[PDB]
Design a protein around this ligand. Sequence first.
Ligand SMILES: Cc1cc2nc3c(=O)[nH]c(=O)nc-3n(C[C@H](O)[C@H](O)[C@H](O)COP(=O)(O)OP(=O)(O)OC[C@H]3O[C@@H](n4cnc5c(N)ncnc54)[C@H](O)[C@@H]3O)c2cc1C
Ligand SMILES: Cc1cc2nc3c(=O)[nH]c(=O)nc-3n(C[C@H](O)[C@H](O)[C@H](O)COP(=O)(O)OP(=O)(O)OC[C@H]3O[C@@H](n4cnc5c(N)ncnc54)[C@H](O)[C@@H]3O)c2cc1C
Ligand SMILES: Nc1ccnc2ccccc12
Ligand SMILES: Nc1ccnc2ccccc12
Lengths: 429, 439
Amino acid sequence: PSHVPFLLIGGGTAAFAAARSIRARDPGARVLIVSEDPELPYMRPPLSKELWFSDDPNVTKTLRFKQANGKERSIYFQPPSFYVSAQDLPHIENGGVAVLTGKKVVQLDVRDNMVKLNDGSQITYEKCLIATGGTPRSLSAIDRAGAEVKSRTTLFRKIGDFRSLEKISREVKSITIIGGGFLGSELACALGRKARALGTEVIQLFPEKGNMGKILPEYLSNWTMEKVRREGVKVMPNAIVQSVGVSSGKLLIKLKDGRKVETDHIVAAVGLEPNVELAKTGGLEIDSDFGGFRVNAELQARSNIWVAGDAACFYDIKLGRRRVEHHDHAVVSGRLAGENMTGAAKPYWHQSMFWSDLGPDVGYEAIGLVDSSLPTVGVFAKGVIFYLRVVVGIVLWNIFNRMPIARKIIKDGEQHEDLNEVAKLFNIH
Amino acid sequence: KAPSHVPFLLIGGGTAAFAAARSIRARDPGARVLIVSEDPELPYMRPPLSKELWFSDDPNVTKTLRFKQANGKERSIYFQPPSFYVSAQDLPHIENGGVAVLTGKKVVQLDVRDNMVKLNDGSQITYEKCLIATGGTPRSLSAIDRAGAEVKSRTTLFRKIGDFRSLEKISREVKSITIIGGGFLGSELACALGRKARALGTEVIQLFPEKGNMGKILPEYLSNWTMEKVRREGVKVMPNAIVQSVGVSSGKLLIKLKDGRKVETDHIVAAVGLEPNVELAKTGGLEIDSDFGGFRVNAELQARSNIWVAGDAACFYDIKLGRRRVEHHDHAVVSGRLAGENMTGAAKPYWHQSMFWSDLGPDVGYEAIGLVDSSLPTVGVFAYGKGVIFYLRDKVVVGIVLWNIFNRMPIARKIIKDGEQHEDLNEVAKLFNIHVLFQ
Ligand SMILES: Cc1cc2nc3c(=O)[nH]c(=O)nc-3n(C[C@H](O)[C@H](O)[C@H](O)COP(=O)(O)OP(=O)(O)OC[C@H]3O[C@@H](n4cnc5c(N)ncnc54)[C@H](O)[C@@H]3O)c2cc1C
Ligand SMILES: Cc1cc2nc3c(=O)[nH]c(=O)nc-3n(C[C@H](O)[C@H](O)[C@H](O)COP(=O)(O)OP(=O)(O)OC[C@H]3O[C@@H](n4cnc5c(N)ncnc54)[C@H](O)[C@@H]3O)c2cc1C
Ligand SMILES: Nc1ccnc2ccccc12
Ligand SMILES: Nc1ccnc2ccccc12
């Protein structure tokens, strides 16, 4: 279309949450999502968890999974029928939400409230959301290596990466994951389960002393490393890749400490870069400290431009400036951006949580500023870890259905005299 | 006195606030604008307080607060006479609204959620659109803070009309005044007191830690040249001076410098920078900028949905020059005018760069625009009686200083805007009628 009232750039979690939010407050709204991916809006978390533990061998085609509640669900937020076509968006009665797949916004003219797509077409808007997310980072060693190495290295992010790596796990005998964070540790447990039935190998190396060394205290990270290892993974901590090359057709990873790792495929899970290409042409400020588009407490960048999701560096009136890369944050902030695009003028207030599952025996939820650099106070019986600066972050270890309590402790900002007494709020005695 | 609700609420009664009120009224005929000013004066301009009012031929200038401009026409220091304003009590009723000023009242609390403010007297005012134009407070030296009350009683922080009247009376009473600070304010007051001191035979000292006046603004060779011009105005300039302590010796102030020198004087004027007034950020939940200070606002000077910031207290995003905060008179006008337009739906970014100027006597006057910083690499082209100094970043001119060259600011504004990578800056100097120095 040549003009649309609401234009959401990017077709991910934040964009979909905004469309549902705009339509809820403006029942007649006409929302156009522009997505460079060929897929309709889908959620990522199942790509590294539930889709790898499915009993259906057609999961690669169906993209369905059983949730914690047991009910089966699709990875997509809505079926295609719930959307309208971009051709009909300006005419359909009571508007709707359209998605323009396979199209990338390459230029943003803030002055004329216009965008230019990769195919030359131009679209003007009245309100606009930037929800571009981010691109996976790559290691300098894989960049400085040959093309044979880059071709045998996976950057896990999209549905295509899940299908590509699932096929690889059924073809080669050894996969090495580089990265000890959420993505690396979850993929290790997933490939470990698959590797147990085939007798194959799954290696995970990272520079920290343990899994989630940057998130969890050392004692809990070390326990996590054992949980991952018991899933069939060969975990190699304190590993800094110096170089990577192909030797006799086999990948050879040379670590700075003299160790060498022979493997068939590499998976790089070493962080995320916010997609801020459009800041240049748009004259939009980016944040030098946290990266991403710099927006205020209401996720607003300019008069008619908001930013949500992984790419949004926002001002938390209580926690300070920050940028979050969590699924529930894209939902909360995407929903908030949609409301503010319809006049709500509301600041980011309801904190978003994140979670991770490392096998069937390890699952935790977290909220707020969770950083191993902050001083921690862990209370275990299952347990809870408090992060301090007043409680600013909480990690619930195998404790579920208690997130509102954690969200309330951080909100109230009390100076607790005994956190062991606070642990009773999570049923720890 | 103050109404319970006003459409437009401007916090602070200075240059940015007045420029916004005039801008709001020009774009929104009939608008109702309430300025809240803790000062007792109606909005007035500051530059004359350190310049034209000290060179006036009228001996009643201290009372009239009028001065002759460069064009020669006489005018008052106030932006408008009282007749231009309406009273806050009548602001909600007068036909086609107006602009009211609530003097002697300070906004002490800001509730962004409820679009409400609380004044120091407990009264509460709700608004639809709000401008924070609080400016800044002069800084004080730690040596003057650690000194006795006798020292604090004879040390002036120059900012308001009261400080001009207080220091003008002092210049006619004591024999030695010492200015601490080598920037614009210190150097302009030194030239002013120097003129007065020549007719009275008194003394004017100016000490600062830099090697010369405006050492942070001008290259070293031009700062040194300026220091000599200031000295020839009757000033005893002491560069490379770091105040260690201050005390009273035989009833006279005694300034002990870290390098062993001592200065005996009767009165001190501290011109050592400005602190943005960001008191209201706490209650308002408004972000302040850790690098440049002030309220952090975007290219449209906006902080939240219905709150803008302009003037000295506004750290904004310059789409061309990057994030910064400016403390210039013309910037308060430009940014105040820009905030006013955006408070009426304009949604316009800071684009037209503001200029600043300074006069150091009758034989030294310069204009400047953009990022003027002595730390940046400079390229000066002179004919130092006349010339232009270019400030560079990424092989591009980001700031210009016109030295005794006037009526050519639009040309400087265009060079910075176009962002060309000039091969020969001497050819660019011809655009300023100059027919070469690196620092
Ligand atoms: C495998 C995986 C597992 C995860 N598991 C969890 C989990 O268990 N718990 C958790 O809390 N979080 C998890 N996350 C993180 C969560 O998925 C992210 O926080 C979330 O996807 C962020 O949504 P977003 O809307 O900001 O961006 P995205 O989901 O990245 O969507 C952005 C979309 O915009 C498109 N785009 C970018 N630039 C342009 C442009 N110029 N024009 C058009 N389109 C453009 C991108 O292609 C992408 O399609 C996981 C992420 C991954 C990849
Ligand atoms: C003596 C002097 C000479 C100058 N000469 C020049 C010059 O030649 N060229 C140049 O470019 N610049 C010059 N400047 C700088 C220029 O004056 C400033 O940039 C300008 O005054 C800034 O305007 P402003 O509106 O941001 O703030 P201000 O003029 O400082 O106005 C702020 C007002 O708000 C009031 N206020 C603050 N907080 C509150 C509150 N909570 N509630 C109510 N009221 C409040 C303050 O009391 C003050 O009255 C000079 C400054 C001075 C002091
Ligand atoms: N489990 C997760 C939590 C937060 N961010 C993530 C990013 C990528 C993969 C997994 C996660
Ligand atoms: N001439 C000036 C320019 C900018 N700031 C100033 C502050 C005080 C005095 C004079 C000036």
